[PDB]
């Protein structure tokens, strides 16, 4: 009942988290465009960006990590010769959290790139 219970109400919190790196991303989006290549936007159109590449890098950190913690509990409690319902509940909600988290943090990693290897 207790390591279930905590189990779920640290999902809640990291949901907030996956929405928040969707929204930031969404945001260097509108940026990276017009900026990649600077042909009109501002000057430092770059006193913004120092700002949201940082941001995004401090959450992505505090999130990626909450992740392997699951992956890496799974793996210790298989192991041990067991077979049970309760952990197969874990690979579920890790699967769903995963696959929403990789559509938005592996496209954030052809971001940067896509910024500089055309800088079009």
């Given at each position: 009942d207790r390591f279930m219970d905590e189990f779920f109400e640290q999902v809640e919190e990291i949901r907030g988290f996956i929405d928040k790196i969707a929204e930031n991303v969404e945001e260097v989006k509108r940026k990276?465009?017009?900026?990649?290549?600077?042909?009109?936007?501002?000057?430092?159109?770059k006193e913004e960006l120092e700002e949201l590449m940082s941001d995004i890098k401090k959450t992505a950190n505090k999130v990626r990590s909450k992740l392997k913690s699951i992956e890496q509990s799974i793996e210790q409690e298989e192991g041990l010769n067991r077979s049970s319902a309760d952990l197969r509940i874990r690979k579920t909600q890790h699967s769903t959290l995963s696959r929403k988290f990789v559509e938005v943090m592996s496209e954030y990693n052809a971001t940067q790139s896509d910024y500089r290897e055309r800088s079009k």
């Open positions: 990276h465009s017009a900026i990649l290549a600077s042909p009109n936007p501002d000057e430092k159109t």
